[PDB]
Amino acid sequence: GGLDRGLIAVGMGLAVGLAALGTGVAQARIGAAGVGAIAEDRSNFGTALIFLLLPETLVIFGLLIAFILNGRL
């Protein structure tokens, strides 16, 4: 081996980082509009919750590529 043993780790960190950044970018507008709707009605709490509960699939694939990289280490 060599410097690759750490370069793979850099890949892990970069992958999870931009994954989290993408989910944050989505969740900002999603939860903002959801909060407005909830403050209006207080009846759509489940719908707003699930709508904010989609965009983290990105970070499960991010942890997925992280874990397969960890196994490949």
Q: Which does 46 bind (CB under 5 to 8 A by kind): a second copy, another protein, none?
A: another protein
Question: Is the separation of the CB atoms in 16 and 59 below 8 Å?
Answer: yes
Minimum gap (Å) between residue 13 Cβ and a second copy: 3
Site string for a second copy, 38-67 (x = CB under 8 A): xxxxx-xx-xx--xxxxxxxxx-xxxxxx-
Cα–Cα distance, 61 to 55 (Å, whole number): 11
Query: Is 4 a binder of another protein (CB under 8 A)?
Result: no
Quick one: tokens of 22? 């993408």
Shortest Å, Cβ 43 to a second copy: 9
- Residue numbers at the binding site for another protein (CB under 8 A): 42-43, 45-47, 49-50, 53-54, 56-57, 60-61, 63-64, 67-68, 70-71
